[PDB]
Design an enzyme around this catalytic site. Sequence first.
Site: not given
Ligand code: HEM
Ligand SMILES: CS(=O)(=O)C/C(N)=N\CCC[C@H](N)C(=O)O
Lengths: 407, 411
Positions: A106, A109, A278, A283
């Site tokens: 992620c 973070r 968000w 994405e």
């Molecule tokens: C607040 C803004 C956030 C942004 C901008 C963000 C951004 C991202 C992005 C770009 C990815 C890659 C996703 C993909 O390629 O499908 C990701 C993965 C992930 N995010 Fe974040 N995220 C956010 C919030 C969160 C929150 C609130 C959580 C959990 C409480 C979280 C947990 C995770 C996890 C566990 C992954 C890996 C999921 C997987 O292996 O498919 N994210 N995030």
């Molecule tokens: C869904 S989330 O927890 O805000 C983390 C994030 N920003 N992306 C996770 C997966 C969303 C997916 N890549 C999509 O384009 O719909």
Amino acid sequence: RFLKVKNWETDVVLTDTLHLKSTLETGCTEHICMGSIMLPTKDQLFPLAKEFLDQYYSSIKRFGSKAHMDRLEEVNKEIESTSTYQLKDTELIYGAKHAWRNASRCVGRIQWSKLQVFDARDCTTAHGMFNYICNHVKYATNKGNLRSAITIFPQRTDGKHDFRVWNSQLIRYAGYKQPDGSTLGDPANVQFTEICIQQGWKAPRGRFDVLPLLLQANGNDPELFQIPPELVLEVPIRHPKFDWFKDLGLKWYGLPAVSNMLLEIGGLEFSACPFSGWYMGTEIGVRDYCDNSRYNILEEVAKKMDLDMRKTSSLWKDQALVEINIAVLYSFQSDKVTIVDHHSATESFIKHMENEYRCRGGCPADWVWIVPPMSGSITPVFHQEMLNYRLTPSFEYQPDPWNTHVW
Amino acid sequence: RFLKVKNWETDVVLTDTLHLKSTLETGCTEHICMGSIMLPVRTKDQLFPLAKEFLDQYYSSIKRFGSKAHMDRLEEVNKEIESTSTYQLKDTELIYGAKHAWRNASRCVGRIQWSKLQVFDARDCTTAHGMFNYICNHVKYATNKGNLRSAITIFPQRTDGKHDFRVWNSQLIRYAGYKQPDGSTLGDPANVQFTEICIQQGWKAPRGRFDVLPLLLQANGNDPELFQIPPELVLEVPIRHPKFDWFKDLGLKWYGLPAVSNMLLEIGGLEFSACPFSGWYMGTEIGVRDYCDNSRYNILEEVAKKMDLDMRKTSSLWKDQALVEINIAVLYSFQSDKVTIVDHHSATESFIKHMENEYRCRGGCPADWVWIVPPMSGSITPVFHQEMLNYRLTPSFEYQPDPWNTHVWKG
Ligand code: HEM
Ligand SMILES: CS(=O)(=O)C/C(N)=N\CCC[C@H](N)C(=O)O
Ligand code: HEM
Ligand SMILES: C[C@H](O)[C@H](O)[C@H]1CNc2nc(N)[nH]c(=O)c2N1
Ligand SMILES: C[C@H](O)[C@H](O)[C@H]1CNc2nc(N)[nH]c(=O)c2N1
Ligand SMILES: CS(=O)(=O)C/C(N)=N\CCC[C@H](N)C(=O)O
Ligand SMILES: [Zn+2]
């Protein structure tokens, strides 16, 4: 045993010690790196409980206090008697925030400590789950000013009474296989959509149909529910320079909310824990719109841009890609729906890494996932060495419920 | 054991058995992945198993495993090792070895080409002047007036580690970098330290933005010597854009022949510390990395200024927009001048075909995803979606430390 990571654009060198506290396995060995692979009892529970409580009490600066030793006793006592235990609210919140903090894939973070935790452990029915989820959707959406949230349903027991959200995300678009051989809507959701139809959903059979929720409470058969449309914020996609862009008829939803992962805290397993933050613009604009196995709009967009599509070397795909992504960011911003660009997000992540190295001794990060799917090397993360390792609490993948559930 | 890799775009699943033949370590463990870390004198004792393994591989490749010719060669090498402490490769083994080091290079996206490599045997070379002459011939052959041909020149192997052949340049052809008193850099900032060494050795620097560096060549552990590549052998391409007529006025050019010269070639336990090799460019190497990295020529702002992009917010994607235009220009320029180059779509599509062929005919294809995926437009290339397995096979190309760090100066 002390490991260094170098940033090759800045020469900044960081020393990682946090990896020693790592427990779960990576998939790699001394002979083979699997870094690019997408998916690589009472006796078990007590050390897991102990390890978590130790880190929890250390974090509130009360390690080895009478309160600490008492809780350890308490959780041991409860495991010995019931074979499981219940988290205090304080521990649940800490565990949830830390599962995010430890998510090596992620890039968002920097936000980890600002997470609203909705305790839904008193939930008993699928209707209850639907209520909790609507409340989460509304709270997180906040009229476009998005707030990160997680809703936590009751923990696994004997494993035959699992709570699950069958959807991969709370909000997604249906996918339909057509007599034509082509796919209408989102090809990623073809299988789930069929499961919905077979369960009774009346599909509009359009390009952007918001899927219904399929909610499983207490290991029972899952049930369908439509999220009130007024709680689903969507953004029509237009381009700040191209007046034709709107005729493509593209839209996306504002709230990304992953609903298919498992939250592990102190050895306890939360199989239904939808969480939301968000979007980073790529994405939607790069992956959701331009993946060949997704909406795959590159061909149509390049055609309207009248680019020379004869030869790959004209970089028509790359030009269209940029414009599609400008439109996504422009549209969300114009409608005041929170979104972050990949330049801004990766810059924040570097600052976060530095904070984590200073204050915690490291930050597990999966470079393959952290580097954005466009313009990789013009973002600072491309030049940042990262160490990937698995810490707990964590979010884990789990198999799709339909492969497992007994009707 | 059998390991599976999946392509998430096509659902093609492949099975790797070749990883079983891997000996060297990766840097990773069961508790930590080091997949993004850039860099994670032998006894007779260790030498004969290394030779035996290599010769077994060589004789299998020519369908002569267990033959009298195979057995006699093992005995001949064994006798040579005990008697002289090393051995000499036959020409055939050297060619096989150099091609296989390329085939095994997990970070190389161009490996579809591995079997077409011109191998120049320079093991009879004794002096820095002799090295200069070999290298000029390599440049002229590989350049081929713009119709680039892959080649490697192989200087004598390491003996006691005190008599090493080294090319001090990191590439045969590269541009000088000069740090100015005001802290700005003129030319290529990647080459500042090496440029300083050249100047100290006696090079008269023209001090411009694209000065081709002199060769700094070390034969037989002796102090290195400077030589200027004849300019008529150094093919260069002025960079212009098919639609943007102001692009030429940025004054950009680049050289046509990329020729990595600072790696070590290991074959059958023998170490070739000077083994410059050349293929041709993928456009992004120049247009993305050499031009747009912040620590390289860093042209993004200037290009976006000239394009009149909204530069006040990153969210306009001005950097991304300029990046594509720069990369169109690089491809257009090379193609217009008939200098071989490959775009990142073609190169990655070809690599997937190569990789599939290797799984079917060899049982695997070690690949480093971090390096294989291009530095722009990653997920619109098929490699982004391809699971890969990274492991180390020999013969191989290895990093070695920079020679100015290790050299014992004779004076
Ligand atoms: C607040 C803004 C956030 C942004 C901008 C963000 C951004 C991202 C992005 C770009 C990815 C890659 C996703 C993909 O390629 O499908 C990701 C993965 C992930 N995010 Fe974040 N995220 C956010 C919030 C969160 C929150 C609130 C959580 C959990 C409480 C979280 C947990 C995770 C996890 C566990 C992954 C890996 C999921 C997987 O292996 O498919 N994210 N995030
Ligand atoms: C869904 S989330 O927890 O805000 C983390 C994030 N920003 N992306 C996770 C997966 C969303 C997916 N890549 C999509 O384009 O719909
Ligand atoms: C024929 C056309 C070739 C193309 C298009 C090509 C393409 C590439 C590219 C894009 C890289 C990554 C370079 C970087 O980011 O710095 C690379 C790396 C590499 N290539 Fe190839 N290559 C070709 C030929 C060769 C040849 C002839 C050899 C050796 C005989 C070779 C061996 C390697 C090695 C060892 C690396 C890794 C270098 C490192 O770790 O710094 N390549 N190649
Ligand atoms: C095969 C490869 O691991 C796979 O395509 C990965 C690459 N990087 C990714 N990165 C992110 N953020 N999301 C993804 O789905 C993927 N897919
Ligand atoms: C830290 C990271 O490993 C480093 O920046 C790598 C990433 N991928 C790369 N890929 C290629 N082809 N060339 C490179 O120089 C790099 N640099
Ligand atoms: C130099 S080579 O052997 O042809 C392999 C290749 N194509 N690139 C390797 C290094 C070139 C380097 N990236 C550069 O931009 O000059
Ligand atoms: Zn690894």
